[PDB]
Structure formats: structure tokens, C-alpha cells
Design a protein around this ligand. Structure first.
Ligand code: CYC
Ligand code: CYC
Ligand code: CYC
Ligand code: CYC
Ligand code: CYC
Ligand code: CYC
Ligand code: CYC
Ligand code: CYC
Ligand code: CYC
Lengths: 160, 96, 68, 161, 160, 161, 160, 161, 161, 160, 161
């Protein structure tokens, strides 16, 4: 979280938290209810968000869903949307934690090696995530949509 | 990653950089990032901080002034007196 | 007890560092006499260049007084 | 380590569940006590040294412990003991901020019972040193925070016994 | 400041500021006028506060001002209140900066070594600061008195 | 490092002065431009990569610099050069937020002139790479912020020459 | 001792002891009989040395036995002389060994932290030790008084 | 570690006793043998290599130990074995100077029995290597010192068996 | 670093000369003053803190140096300055024991003039801090040792100017 | 010296010399005139000691002055007595210093390479020095002969 | 550092050229001498110690250099000097195998002239030590390899002067 990150840096330098570290915990916790609302809205529309990401993806890359494509077929496509459902879930976790610790250990560290083995094209997974940003972001107020958007762009960043 | 412990690297110039600031500036700033590096050396090499007599100044003075690197500050600490004493002397040779 | 004064350019061609490695490549530092040979060679082996050498601390052909 | 919030995230992650109503209620129960935890930490930190001194005075010194034959005899060992005390106080303050005792297990209790058996460090006497610091802490931090600080001192002390 | 602290952490990790870091700059700057008012009130009463704190320090520690005391005499007492005036000044700086960077470089790093040389009892300097908290805090609204109080308790903390 | 605000605090601290009217006026002159600095940083950060690409295209590549014998020949050195460019852009964004160039001296310029002389890195060509990024930046950030962003690019470039 | 110190330096180098360090030991052996005798003499008058040290101390620093003084009261004074008895004992140990060694481990390493906690003024403990030097030294021949005096001045030095 | 003198000091320190007549008699019993210990150490040190050579010749080599299948077969292991021998000789010389065996426990015997079991190092054969060096030592150091040197070799050898 | 006994040996070694009558006379001139050097060191060491305090009081504090704008303003810098003072005192005590100033060059003066120029540390003010400690030292150590202690303080101070 | 070895311990712990350290300097310096006399006697008979050492050593091991010997011939031999003259000198620089540091820097540091390189047989050489012991020792009183003998046996030890 | 095969590859790569009959002819001129380089290296390596011994005997020892006042006086210095000699021999063997002197610049000559000036190491005497090892080497390796080994010793020696 913001808490975990602050503390780990504190303990590693053998010291109490800084004024800065204390301030960010305070600003973070003040945004608690708002962050919880952002996760709720997105949890509430999860099934819609994945199908609109999935449509946006297959237009932009009809090949992935083509003879020599990693997601070619009905059940190679079913698993692909399931992976898109996984990442949206992790994005809700990140938003309520206020950093990526959880998102990272669960779904980016090791992701290159996993997908290389499965021979999944990584950069088109990054596209599927942009597609989810676009849908999710259209169900949130301007301010909340930006706050959510940072976590989408992080995942897009880590698959790189 | 975040799955392991922090790594402190002294990028912050140090060096007693100087500037275009008041000659006897009070706040100075960022000669306090070195100071946390200095205590973190102790925390790896001995695991805790030492007591008052014990700390090795004049190794720090030089690190802080920019004359020697991090690498050589570790060397001075490693080859020091209390390091020998705490960790070499009382144990069987290969345990040490 | 003698110290050397040293100047070197350490350059890393294929590693690629994002942020602030300017201290990392070029530096001046004091090194002890007994670690100079090894330090010098740590620097030649990674493509660095040594600008200058300073005793800083000894006397030139001192038979005694040098010691470790 | 984990705190209140990451305790919940990891409990759901292993089930691959988005956070649901029960989860969201737990996190609220943490956030709603958060400001009070911060104020309490600032009192403990800024009175650190006085808490140790009053806790030692009530539960350790003026005794056989500080006399020849006692484990906190010698300036060396007296220093080691109040050094330890500072660890406990400081980490309990972390646990209470995090609202999770997991850090007390990972970085304090693991192996400590046997470490103390191996050096001869008196366990029962150390627990009293913990429960005396709790007593002092509970006065200084006030109604708001007393119960919440207290539990992580109690976590520490049943971790040794 | 809050700015300096945020930036230094940014530059050291070779990156732009975080959403968190940006948020705290925003909350901080919103409290600007209030923080400036807190410093003004205390600047405006600096005499009152320093004198009063000296009467209360010398009541709990009557001997500092006694034969073998560091502050024994009229001009050993004059310098003692001057030091109390110094620290109140630094406290006003800290409040307007929103952290301790300035307070720290000017008057805590090196303070043990300075006072040990002069043989000044450090913990009774910490008492003089508590005494100033008590006076200063009685000239501020509840909310502003707390905000000020954090910086007093920091100095009390650092002399330790 | 220092910013606008700590520049003033340290200038008064060395005189042991409480902040007076002249000081308070300076700090106002910073706070009153603050919101605009933030917006400008968000434009630069989010267009970072495009600014480097347009700056390189106008001032570095399609040239002898990128050809055999040139300092940005080899993928290694081309990568090092646009890596540098990102540093400049990023730090100038820090300087402009802080409203103080001191960070550009402490963490960027110190020793850099000689470092470039020692490697053979062409100084004049690097300045053009800086002044091209400024040109792009000044378009993207708009009337509000153009002059303020620009100065720290100019600080960087007269720091090398 | 002199033995322990010589040997530890020898073993660190992993070579048998030299000439130049196999001498000092010989001096110490001859010295030890005299050294043992001085310690016995000091031990005989311990109660007188402590008590007269304690009077000399409270004249020179009456503030420690005053309202806000660490040693204020009948016990708080009883414990203070007991600490003076402790240090005289350690001084007899140091003299006999020929090297300070054990005294350091027993009563100076950690002493700052101990007394800071108890809030005991360290420099007035150093005075109590000077006071003991003065008394003890008046019960010894010129030559033996100097030899003893080095160990008193060491303790005075270490509380610094 | 401890020597004769610190053995007594620490035994009294735990009782908080000033040194009394019984203590003072013990310390005298050490000081009165001190000059002889020094002379003996100078003989051992300066004949170190010859003592090992004569001890190996009487108790180790010309045997199955040095032949294929034997633990001191290979120049590597032969070197390790006489390296060990030098440790024993050197530390026994420390113990005898100190007039206390505590260093032989702290820095030589602790874990050594099991270390030798784990590598396969023959214990009985190593003891003979110790008791052969003692035999040589007792000739070289003379009547004055023979019994005193001998005991710390005997301490070493009953520490392994 | 070398002394009077060692310097005589090195100075002759480079000429490959046995020690001859002139050499032997020099060494005597050192040995004959040796006991007095030791007594003087024990006075300085045991009055270390008081010498610094009285030297600072006569030559540094109650001045613009300790006021805002002054180099020993801030507890940080005041601490650094009297830290330095302790170095000088301590090393001068080494030089005087050794009867040779070579250690003052090797471990104190080398680069120090420029180090002080680079930080802004006032040289003339530091010399007065040295010559005030000398004044105090010369009172405490007495007729026997006054001139001999004094010279290495004078060595230090003409090393900076 | 004793000074060089010991002060080094002082400086490394950032402190003034101990009572112990001061005592050994005092006992050491008291033993000065005698040590100077021991060096004088031996300096005064250097040519005799070397020559008679040279006759003695080629009995206990002659092979070195034979067809396949390192010292075979008039100039392979003379460089041999000159080396014996070198080591006697070092046994006397060291005598006046009261320890081995000066000797070590000039003669036993990296001395097992000169010789290995030269394939001078080093272990014969140790014997060579023990013999400068037999002659030198016959020109000194019992007490001074022992004190000298420690330094001869050291060199014999170091060539090993 | 590069070999022979990539010193030609880098000459043509700072031009964009491909490998033109001229390149292929150069590489052949290396490959065709390759087998001869390999033994020569096996002779030098296996006679390393004897070459140094005979080179020192003809050009360094039995002289003022090894006497008091000389730079290879003291076992410490003598060891450092023949240590250096081994470097030269070993690296020259690398240069000759590679058929390129670039390694002698990168890892041996760079800064060495001034290093020797700073320590006082006699340059002319060191060159004679190099040209004596060459003399010995040229006998041992035979007609096949004599000229090719020789040049990298000559490279070394004009690198110092
Ligand atoms: C955090 C602040 C910071 C800066 C700014 C920095 C610069 C810097 N640039 C470097 C090299 C370089 N810099 C360049 C730059 C260029 N080449 C060109 O032709 C252009 C004119 C220019 C780009 C516009 C190149 C090509 C090198 C590689 C030189 C080599 O091959 O060794 C190096 C040597 C180490 C390395 O290669 O990474 C440093 C330290 N280091 C730092 O720590
Ligand atoms: C052998 C090593 C050793 C020492 C020295 C030692 C000292 C020591 N001094 C103590 C108290 C004390 N010591 C003093 C001493 C003084 N008051 C003054 O103002 C004077 C400066 C000074 C007398 C010269 C006083 C007044 C107390 C009581 C403090 C309290 O109860 O808060 C205590 C706590 C009481 C106890 O449990 O015994 C210890 C352990 N302990 C050790 O293991
Ligand atoms: C970061 C978490 C952490 C903890 C908590 C910790 C405890 C700890 N306590 C230790 C010793 C000790 N601990 C004590 C404690 C006490 N003595 C008493 O009589 C009292 C009952 C008690 C104080 C209330 C003492 C006296 C020693 C020294 C034992 C010895 O002499 O070896 C040691 C051995 C190493 C050392 O001496 O420093 C450790 C590691 N280490 C850690 O890394
Ligand atoms: C397979 C690995 C291996 C080797 C090589 C080895 C050698 C070895 N050579 C020995 C003795 C010896 N070796 C020699 C050899 C020589 N004398 C000379 O002058 C010549 C230079 C040389 C003959 C070319 C001599 C003379 C001894 C007897 C030395 C003594 O007893 O003191 C001994 C001790 C006697 C014994 O117990 O066997 C061993 C172990 N041991 C091993 O495990
Ligand atoms: C400072 C105190 C100290 C001691 C004493 C010590 C002993 C010691 N002996 C060892 C091995 C050994 N020790 C021996 C000893 C012998 N072989 C025989 O056959 C004989 C019976 C005997 C000699 C008389 C041998 C042969 C090995 C090598 C085992 C292997 O090959 O791994 C090792 C394993 C690491 C190594 O190989 O160096 C240790 C640590 N280590 C210490 O730190
Ligand atoms: C802004 C950062 C800063 C601070 C804080 C500072 C303190 C400071 N306090 C001093 C003295 C002093 N300070 C005190 C203070 C006290 N005596 C007590 O017992 C109490 C515990 C305490 C009052 C609460 C006393 C008594 C002296 C005189 C000590 C002497 O002259 O030996 C001095 C030496 C006198 C001078 O030259 O000014 C300095 C520099 N200097 C700085 O640059
Ligand atoms: C072991 C030998 C040795 C010496 C002597 C030494 C001196 C030394 N003095 C320093 C700074 C300093 N030195 C002083 C000294 C003074 N200020 C004044 O106004 C007075 C005139 C004077 C005291 C009498 C001050 C104030 C600084 C801090 C400068 C800064 O703020 O960076 C520094 C920079 C690193 C640091 O701050 O510790 C060194 C290395 N370092 C060494 O290793
Ligand atoms: C002060 C420190 C020091 C020493 C000791 C020293 C020794 C030394 N001995 C040498 C030669 C020699 N030394 C000897 C000695 C001996 N031959 C034997 O067989 C016997 C075992 C032994 C006589 C006891 C011989 C025979 C040579 C000639 C070897 C040759 O020329 O190959 C040489 C080369 C000749 C020269 O240039 O002087 C040096 C430098 N140099 C030093 O700087
Ligand atoms: C890997 C490439 C490499 C080389 C070649 C190298 C040379 C080198 N020679 C050195 C010293 C030296 N070099 C010599 C050499 C000689 N003395 C003489 O009189 C002769 C003329 C000459 C031998 C033929 C000596 C005597 C010293 C010691 C100087 C001192 O006492 O400090 C040192 C100083 C550090 C040390 O003492 O080890 C270096 C680094 N270092 C390297 O890393």
C-alpha cells in the first residue's frame, strides 16, 4: 500500500517515519472513501468492461484471433477475456491500496516469462488493457477517471 | 522489486557540491540524504547502530565531503576495529 | 600508511542506466596503497580510463614508515 | 509484512476475487480509525525515551537484575536491554499504525525466544518490561487510542511466553 | 519543504512525481494562508512566549539556575532565553515549510555535540520547548494549535 | 537542493531573521504562479517521449552525428544520447516546479562539461538538442507557462557552453 | 590485561608473539606484585575514600543534591555513593591486571546510555571520580600514587 | 577469552567482591610463573616448523594415512593437515601464556569434533599428532616449562576424544 | 608515519649506514626526554574536553563566528568545529609523543588548506583555536614539557597559513 | 616501535593513550641505554660475527657451496656473507626501536618471493641467522645475550 | 580490447564498409600465422619463471638497484618488481596471441608512466628488464615465432620511454 511502502523504507533505514511519509499517509487515508467508490463502480460493471475491451482489441488486432494467432478460436478467446478480467480485478486492488505492491507480485513480476512460454503477444495484452481503460473511464467522474487511469497506464507500462 | 529489501545507492552527489546560494546558508538541503546512507551502512555491516564511542568518524567525514566513494567507506568499516571485535574474535574460526 | 589519489573514467557501454549515473561514470577518490593495484585493474577491465595518480599520503622511496 | 489493507487484498487475491461488500466493510473499519493511530504514534515517538525510563523504573532496575549475577548487570548489558526496549516500543508503534501484528512476527518474535534462552536473557522479566511500557503508553495516548496501542504490546508479550 | 522532500525522492528514483506526491503538494498549498497566519500570531507574541517558557522551565528545574547549573546567573540565563527565541523562530519556519528540512539543518543536526561541549543539559532544553508549546498553543485556535504542536513535539523529539 | 521557498528560508536563517515583508513578497510571487507550474509539468511528463523524438528530429539525426564516425553512431550510443535527453527534460521539469535552478547544478551540470570532453561527446550538438526540446515544450504548455519552462532549458544550455 | 591485549593483537595477525610484545609482559609481571599491593591498599580504605569523595563532590557541585538534582535526597544520595564504590572497585581491577580491559566492559561501554536514561549528569560523575583520586592518592607513596592515578584519570576520560 | 587473571576478576565481579586474600594468592601463583611462560613461547614459536615436521614424522606420515584412500592423501589434504597442526601448536602456546584453556574452547574445540566427523577426518590420528607435538615441545622448553606447556596439549586432545 | 627512533633508522638506511656515533647521540637525545613526554600526554588526554572548552571560549565563541552568517553557526557546524579541535589536540599529542611532526603532515595537513577553502572554513580563526589550545596545554603540562608540546601546535598552525 | 604499534591503536579508536599504553612506553624507554649498548657491542664486532657465522654455516649444511648449490662459487658466496651482514644490521635497527616494524618493512615483507625467485634455499638461510646468534651471543652478558637472542630467533622464525 | 579479427571488423565498421577482398587478405595473413603463435605461448607460459630469473640476472640485480637507496631494495620492493615483470611477460603473450597491441594500452600502459614517476620507479631500468625478457624469449621460441613475440615487448618499452 502507501503504508507498506512508507514503512519498509522506514525500517530499512532504521528509523521512524518522516514528516513527508506521515503526510502522504494522511492524504491517502482522506481519499479512502473516494478510492472505495472508484473500485465499487468498476467492480459493478466488470462484465461490461471486459466485452468492450475485447471488442476494441479484436478490431485493432483481428490477427490474434486469426489462424496463427495466440487467441484464435472460441476457447482461446474465452481464456483471453478471463485474463482481461484478472487484470481489471488487480487494477481495483491497486486503486484501493494506493500503490502497486499487490498488482506487481500477483501479475507483472514473471509475466514476461509466463506469456513467452504460452507464446502470447505481450504488446497486444497491453492493448487489451488500454481498451479497458477506455471503457472503465467512461463510467467515472473526471476526477475519479484520472485517478483510476494511472493504475491502468501502470499495467500497460509494466508489460513493456 | 518490491519483493526484496531496499537498496541504498548514493547517487546524491554528495561531494560538497557548493552552488549560487547564500554563503553561510542555513538550510543547505540534501546533505541529509547522505546521512541516511551513512546509517544504513551500519545497519548492514553490523546490523544495528553502534554506541557513542564506537562509530567511525573520519571515514564518514570523508564520504560526506566527497573524497571517497561508498565502496571505500564500506572497506573502512569492514576492516575496522569493532568489526573485528564483535564478529571475529569470539568465535571459532570458521564460524567467523 | 600511504594513500593514492586517483582519477578515472568508468564507462558502461551495454548495461544502460536510466537515472543519474553521472557520479556514476567519472570520479575522483582516495584509495589506499594496498588496494590500488586491485582498484586500478577493476577500472581497466571495465573500459575505464585513469586520468591521474596522487600519493596524497606517502613519501617517495621511504624504506621505513610506509607500513600498512 | 502486511497491514490491515494488504491483509484483505492478499486474502482475496488467492481466491482471485474482486473486493466485495464484506471486504469493503473491513477496510472502512480501518480507515475510520486511521487519524487516531497517527496522533498516537506521534505521542509515543516524541516520549520514547521517557516511556523506557518509566517502564524500566517500575519493572526492571532497583533489583537483583541490575546487581552482580543479574542479566542487566554491566553497562554493556544494561545498554543492550534498554536498546531492546526501544525496539519493542518502536515496532509496536509500527504494528499499531499498520493495524496488523504480522511485522511483530517477521521482524521481532521469530527465533527470539530461543535467542534469549541461549544467552540466558530472563523472559518473564522482559515481559514485565513490555507490559510496563504499555501501561505508560496507555496514559500518554488517551481514550482515543489506548486499546489499540495496548494490543500490540500484548501481542509481543504472549509471543515470548 | 513538502516540495523539496517530494522532489528529492522523485529525482533520486529518476522519475516524475507520483499522484500521491502531487496530492500532498495540493493539500499543503491549500493550507498556505492558514500556516502563514499561525506563524504570524506566534511571531507577534515572541516575547511573551519565550519569557513565560523560561519561568516554567525554571520551576521544574530550579537548579539549572543554581550554583552548579549550566544557566546559573543573569547572563547565563540571558543566553538560555536567546536559545529559546532561536528555537521558536525555527518552529515558525517549519510550520510554513510543512516539514523539518530547515529546522533540522539549522538547529538539530550537530546539537548534541554543541551542547555536550558547552555542557548544557539537553533534556532541560527539551523542557524549555514543551514550555513554549504550552504558551504558544494558548494563543491559537484549536485546529491551528494542533498543527503548530506537531513542530514543537518534533524539536522535543530530536533533542533525544 | 533548494526551491523558491527554501531559497528564502536559508537566506534568512543565516542572518537569523524572522521572515519580513520583502521575504513574504517573494514567497507570494512563487505561490501565485504555482498552479500553472503543475499543469505544465503534467503536459511535459505525458508528452516526454514525443518531445524527445521531435527534438532529435530537428536537431540531431539525419546527419553526420548518426553516421559512422559520429558520436551517436551505434544503437548503444544513440540509446545513451536519448537517455541523456530524457534526463534533461525530466530535471528541467523539476527545476521549473521548484522555481529554482539549484537542482540543475547539484544533480546535472556538476562535472558534466569535462565528462563530455573525456568521452568526446559533442557539446554544441547537445545544446541544440536542449534548445529544440525547449521549442517543443513552449508550444505544448501554452502562454501561461512558456517563459517559466523555457528558462531552465536555457540554464542547462549555458551550463555546458 | 597486558596479556590479553598483547595476545589478541598477536592472534589477529596469526603469528606467534614477537620480541617487542613478549617484553611488556615481563615488565607487567614485576609490576603486578606492586600492582596487586596497590589494589589491596585501596581496598582496605574503601569506605573512607568513598565517603570523603562524596563530601568533596557535594561541596564542588551542590546542585546534584538540590530540588531538581539527580542525587537529591537520602537515598538518591545513597545510590550515588554506591556508584562511587563501584568505580573504585573497577579501578583496583584495572591496576592489578596492568591493562584497563575488564573495567571498560563492566562500567564505561554503555555508561552514556545508562546515565542519560536515569538522567544522571555525567560530568559530575567524572568529578566524583577526581574526588576519589584525591583521597586514594593521599594513602599511597608518590610512585604508587602516580601508577594508581592513571587509572582514575582514564575513567574520568571515558565519561566524556 | 579469559586468562588466569581475568578468570579471577570475573569470578569476583559476579559476586561484586573486591579482591580478597584467596584471590590475591591465586594471582601471585600466576605472576610467579610468568617469566618462564614467556621463554617457553619463544622456543615454541622459533621451532614451530621443526616441531610439526618431527611430530608428523613420528605420528602421521609413512603410513596408510598418506597413501591413496587415506585422509592426508593429496597435496591439498596434506597441506590442510599440517596447517591444522600449526593452529594447535600456536593456540596451545596462547593457552599456556594465558594460563587458561578458555581460548582453546572458544576458538578451536567448539564444533570441531563434528566438523571432523562430517569431512571424515580421523580423530584418533589427530590426537596422536597433538601428543607427538607435546613430546617434542617438552624436550625443547626444558624442566622450567615442560609440565605447563604439556597440559594445554592434553586439553586439546581430550577435547576431541 | 614515523618517530624519532624510526626516523634515525630510515635516514641511515637510505645511506646504508650503520648506526654510528652521531646517530646514537640523536637517539639518546630522544630517550632522555621520553618519560616527560608520557606524563604530558596523560595530562592532555585527561583534560582534553576542558582544553577545547577554554580554547573555544578565548578564541572562537561570543562572536560573529557563532552568529547567523558565521561558519560555526548551527549546532551542526559548532559540533563539526569542536570535533576538528579534538583532532588537532589528539594528533599534536601523538606528534609530541613520537617527537616527530611527520604524522601531522600525513594524516592532518595534507589537502586541509584547500578543503577549508572549498567549504568556506575560516583559516585564521582556526589557527587562533589552535594557538589557544597550546596556551592552555602549556599551563597544564608544566616546565618539563611546555616547549615540547608547544612546537607541534605551532607546526599545525603554520601548516594552514 | 612500541610507540608506532601502540599509538596506531589509539588513533584507530579516536582517543588518547590509555594508562596501560603510557606505562609500557615508560617501562620500555627505561630499558633504552641497555638496548643501545647491546646494538653497539654487535655493531662493533660486525665483521667478526659475519665471518665466523659464514664458517659455521657451511658445516651444518655445505651442499649450498657445491656444483649444484645456490651459493656455489666466490661471488655466489660473497653475496652470501653480505646478506648475512644485512640481517645482523636489521637485528640492530630493531633493537633500538624495541619492536619489529622497522625491520619488517625493510626485510621480511615479501621476502619469500625474492628468494623463491632466486631459488636461494630460504630454509638454509634461517639457519644462517641462527648462527649469527651463536657468535653475537658470546660477546654479550647473559641478560643482554637473551634480549638479543629473541630478535635472532624471530628472523629464523620468519624464514619459515 | 579486441583481437585481430575484430580489429579489422571495427575498422570497416566505422565506415559502413563490408569486407572487401582487402579485408579478407588481412584476416588470412593472421590465420596463416596462428598455429605458431599458440605454441610460442606454451613455451613462454611454461618457462615464465626462468625468463624472469634470467632477465633480472642480466638487467636488474647485482647492482645499486638492489642495494640500500635502490628502488628494488627490500623484499617488499623486490617482490613488487618481479611481480610487475610477470605482468609484462604475461600480457605481451596475450598481445602476441591476439596479434594486436591494443590490450597493452588498455590494461598495462595507461597511466603507468606517471604511476612510476609518482612512486619513483626507475623507467630506464624497467625498459632494460623488458628488453632482457625479450632476448630470453626469442631464444626459447625459435625462428618461427621470434620476430612476432619480440614486437610486443618493443611495444611495451617504447610505451614507457
Ligand atoms: C542524472 C544526470 C546525468 C547525466 C546527464 C549523465 C550523462 C552521461 N552521458 C554519458 C555518455 C554519453 N552521452 C552521450 C550523449 C550524446 N551523444 C551525442 O552525440 C549527442 C550530442 C548527445 C545526446 C544529445 C553519448 C553518445 C554517450 C556515450 C559515450 C560512450 O560511448 O562512452 C555518461 C557515461 C556513462 C554512460 O555511458 O552512461 C554519463 C554519466 N549521467 C548522469 O548521471
Ligand atoms: C559497575 C557498573 C555499573 C554502574 C556504575 C551502575 C550504576 C547505576 N546507577 C543507578 C542509579 C543512580 N545513580 C546515581 C548517581 C549519581 N547521582 C548524581 O547526581 C551524581 C552525578 C551520581 C553520583 C556520583 C543516582 C542519583 C541514582 C538514582 C537515579 C534514579 O533512581 O532515578 C542505577 C539504577 C539503580 C539500580 O538498580 O541499581 C544503576 C544500575 N550500574 C552498573 O552496573
Ligand atoms: C530488531 C529486532 C531485534 C531484537 C528485539 C533483538 C534482541 C537481542 N537481544 C540481544 C541480547 C541481550 N538482550 C538483553 C535484554 C535484557 N536483559 C535483561 O536482563 C532484561 C530482562 C532485558 C531487557 C528488558 C541483554 C542483557 C542482552 C545481552 C546478552 C549478552 O551479554 O550477550 C541480542 C544479541 C546480540 C546483541 O547483543 O545485540 C539480540 C539480537 N535483536 C534484534 O535484531
Ligand atoms: C601424488 C601427490 C603427492 C606427492 C607428490 C607427495 C610427496 C611426498 N614426498 C614426501 C617426502 C620426500 N620427497 C622427497 C623428494 C625429493 N627430494 C629432493 O631433494 C628432490 C627435489 C625430490 C625428488 C625429485 C624427499 C627427499 C622426501 C623425504 C623428506 C623427509 O623425510 O623429510 C612425503 C612425506 C613422506 C610420506 O609420508 O610419504 C610426501 C607425502 N605426497 C602426495 O600425496
Ligand atoms: C582456527 C581453528 C581452526 C581449526 C583447527 C580448523 C580445522 C579445519 N580442518 C579442516 C579440514 C581438514 N583437516 C584435515 C586434517 C587432518 N587430516 C588428517 O588425515 C590428519 C588426521 C589431520 C591432520 C593431523 C584434512 C585432511 C582436511 C581436509 C578435508 C577435506 O578434504 O575437505 C577444515 C575445513 C575447511 C578447510 O578445509 O580448511 C577446518 C575448518 N579450522 C579452524 O578455523
Ligand atoms: C539554531 C541552532 C543553534 C543552537 C540551538 C545553538 C546553541 C548554543 N548554545 C550555547 C550555550 C548554552 N546553551 C545553554 C542551554 C541550556 N542550559 C541548560 O542547562 C538547559 C538544558 C539549556 C536551556 C534550555 C547553556 C547553559 C549554555 C552555556 C554553556 C557554556 O557557556 O558552557 C552555545 C555557545 C554559546 C554561543 O557562542 O552562542 C551555542 C552555539 N547554536 C546554534 O547554532
Ligand atoms: C583526521 C584529520 C581530519 C580533519 C582535521 C578533518 C577536518 C574537516 N572539517 C570539515 C568541516 C568543517 N570544519 C569546520 C571547522 C570550523 N568551523 C569554524 O568556524 C572554525 C573556524 C573551525 C573550528 C575551529 C566546520 C564548521 C565544518 C563544516 C562545514 C560544512 O558545513 O560543510 C570536514 C568535511 C567533512 C565533515 O563535515 O566532517 C573535514 C574532513 N577531517 C579529517 O579527516
Ligand atoms: C636487506 C633486505 C635484503 C636482502 C636480504 C637482499 C638479498 C639479496 N641476495 C641476493 C643474492 C644472493 N644471495 C645469496 C645468499 C645465499 N646463498 C646461499 O646458498 C645461502 C643460503 C645464502 C647465504 C647465507 C647468493 C648465493 C646470491 C647470488 C644468487 C645469484 O646471483 O643468482 C640479491 C641479488 C644480488 C644483488 O643485486 O644484490 C639480493 C637483492 N636484498 C635485500 O634488499
Ligand atoms: C595489470 C597491469 C599493472 C602493472 C604493470 C602495475 C604496476 C605497479 N607497480 C607498482 C609498484 C612498484 N613497481 C616496482 C617496479 C620496479 N622496481 C624497480 O626498481 C624496477 C625498475 C621495477 C621492476 C623491473 C616497485 C619496486 C614498486 C613499489 C613502489 C613502492 O614501494 O610503493 C604499483 C603500485 C601498487 C603496488 O605496489 O602494487 C602498480 C600498480 N599495476 C598494474 O595493475
Amino acid at each position: 500500500s502507501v503504508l507498506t511502502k512508507a514503512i519498509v523504507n522506514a525500517d530499512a533505514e532504521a528509523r521512524y517515519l518522516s514528516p513527508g511519509e506521515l503526510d502522504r499517509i494522511k492524504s491517502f487515508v482522506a481519499s479512502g472513501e473516494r478510492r472505495l467508490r472508484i473500485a465499487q463502480t468498476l467492480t459493478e460493471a466488470r462484465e461490461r468492461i471486459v466485452k468492450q475491451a475485447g471488442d476494441q482489441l479484436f478490431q485493432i488486432r483481428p490477427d490474434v484471433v486469426s489462424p496463427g494467432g495466440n487467441a484464435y478460436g472460441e476457447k482461446m478467446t474465452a481464456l483471453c477475456l478471463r485474463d482481461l478480467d484478472y487484470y481489471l480485478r488487480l487494477v481495483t486492488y491497486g486503486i484501493v491500496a494506493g500503490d502497486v505492491t499487490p498488482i506487481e507480485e500477483i501479475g507483472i513480476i514473471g509475466v514476461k516469462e509466463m506469456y513467452n512460454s504460452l507464446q502470447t503477444p505481450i504488446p497486444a495484452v497491453a492493448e487489451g488493457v488500454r481498451a479497458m481503460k477506455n471503457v472503465a473511464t467512461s463510467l467515472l467522474s473526471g476526477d475519479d477517471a484520472a485517478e483510476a487511469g494511472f493504475y491502468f497506464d501502470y499495467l500497460v507500462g509494466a508489460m513493456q | 522489486t518490491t519483493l526484496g529489501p531496499k537498496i541504498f545507492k548514493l547517487t546524491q552527489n554528495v561531494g560538497f557540491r557548493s552552488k549560487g546560494m547564500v554563503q553561510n546558508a542555513g538550510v543547505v538541503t540534501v546533505e541529509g540524504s547522505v546521512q541516511a546512507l551513512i546509517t544504513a551502512a551500519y545497519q548492514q555491516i553490523f546490523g544495528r547502530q553502534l554506541y557513542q564511542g564506537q562509530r567511525l568518524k573520519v571515514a564518514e567525514i570523508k564520504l560526506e565531503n566527497g573524497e571517497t566513494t561508498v565502496k571505500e567507506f564500506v572497506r573502512a568499516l569492514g576492516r575496522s576495529e569493532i568489526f573485528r571485535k564483535l564478529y571475529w574474535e569470539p568465535f571459532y574460526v570458521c564460524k567467523a | 600508511s600511504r594513500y593514492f589519489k586517483v582519477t578515472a573514467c568508468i564507462p558502461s557501454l551495454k548495461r544502460v542506466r536510466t537515472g543519474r549515473e553521472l557520479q556514476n561514470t567519472f570520479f575522483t577518490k582516495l584509495v589506499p596503497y594496498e588496494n590500488w593495484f586491485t582498484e586500478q585493474q577493476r577500472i581497466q577491465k571495465a573500459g575505464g580510463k585513469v586520468l591521474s595518480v596522487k600519493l596524497f599520503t606517502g613519501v617517495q622511496g621511504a624504506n621505513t614508515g610506509v607500513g600498512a | 509484512m502486511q497491514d490491515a489493507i494488504t491483509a484483505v487484498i492478499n486474502n482475496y487475491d488467492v481466491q482471485g476475487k474482486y473486493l466485495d461488500g464484506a471486504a469493503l466493510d473491513k477496510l472502512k473499519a480501518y480507515f475510520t480509525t486511521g487519524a487516531v493511530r497517527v496522533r498516537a504514534a506521534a505521542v509515543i515517538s516524541s516520549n520514547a525515551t521517557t516511556i523506557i525510563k518509566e517502564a524500566a523504573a517500575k519493572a526492571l532496575i532497583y533489583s537483583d537484575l541490575t546487581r552482580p549475577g543479574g542479566n542487566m548487570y554491566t553497562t554493556r548489558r544494561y545498554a543492550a536491554c534498554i536498546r531492546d526496549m526501544d525496539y519493542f516500543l518502536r515496532y509496536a508503534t509500527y504494528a499499531m499504525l499498520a493495524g496488523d501484528p504480522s511485522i511483530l512476527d517477521e521482524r521481532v518474535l521469530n527465533g527470539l525466544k530461543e535467542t534469549y534462552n541461549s544467552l540466558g536473557v530472563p523472559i518473564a522479566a522482559t515481559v514485565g518490561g513490555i507490559q510496563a511500557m504499555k501501561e505508560v503508553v496507555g496514559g500518554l495516548v488517551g481514550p482515543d487510542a489506548a486499546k489499540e496501542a495496548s494490543i500490540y504490546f500484548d501481542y509481543l508479550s504472549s509471543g515470548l511466553s
